[PDB]
Amino acid sequence: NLNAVRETMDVLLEISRILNTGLDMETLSICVRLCEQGINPEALSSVIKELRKATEALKAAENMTS
Amino acid sequence: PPWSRLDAQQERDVRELVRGVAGLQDEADPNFQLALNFAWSNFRFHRFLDVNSHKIEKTIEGIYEKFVIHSDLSKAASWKRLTEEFLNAPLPSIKEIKTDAHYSILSLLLCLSDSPSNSS
């Protein structure tokens, strides 16, 4: 049920906001879909963390080059 | 073969994840391809255990306790309510309740938590 999926995404976003995870609704829904496909949650979290670290390093490099 | 389509969908979702988190919008960027390959490698060859629902629940309760101790009773209540709703909510692909996807999402949020006791 589309409403149940939307409620699940809103719950995930509210948890992220309480936890100040900085995840938007789309990224949360993508992570949920990937977990439903049987992706290991620790692996998914490690990938997300690595992508975040890479983005922070890129932004820091640009801010040192700007 | 359906295995290859499942792997391609996983790789697509991981590529979109890398795009969103790393900001690499251009798939021709070597950093984008590196992130996509790393994500697909981790998804196919992970050594992690399956998601433990009780562990996710315990992390949610620990964040609730943290907010309560920080006297942020509103943050504690919101965290607990949202995690319970998520664990009791159907996922976009999975209609069943309290599925491994729900506990995986809760585990992800707990790992992604940033000072939940001090957040508004």
Next chain:
Amino acid sequence: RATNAQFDSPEILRRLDVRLLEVSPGDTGWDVFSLDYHVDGPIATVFTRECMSHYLRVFNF
């Protein structure tokens, strides 16, 4: 041991402890440190789970 807490009774000192909340990145110790007081048995009727949570909240704050 470095402060007057060492002079507290072992039955009191054994109940005073450091609790660490679930550690998140970016959190400081102020957000996760709390004192706790374990209440059980008949004393748990007066020092209920709500009472213990309130005491721990005041301690952490």
Next chain:
Amino acid sequence: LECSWDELWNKVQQAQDLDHIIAAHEVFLDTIISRCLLDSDSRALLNQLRAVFDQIIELQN
């Protein structure tokens, strides 16, 4: 915290029954939570105090 704890201890020492002790300790704990901003009703006050503490920590750093 200290005043509500002393009130709890005095009430327990003055308690006439187990239910009276439980109620007096619960009331003391609720008073401590409210005055330490740890109760449900003081949550806005607790949030303002937490923001003050966070700004104090930022200033300290």
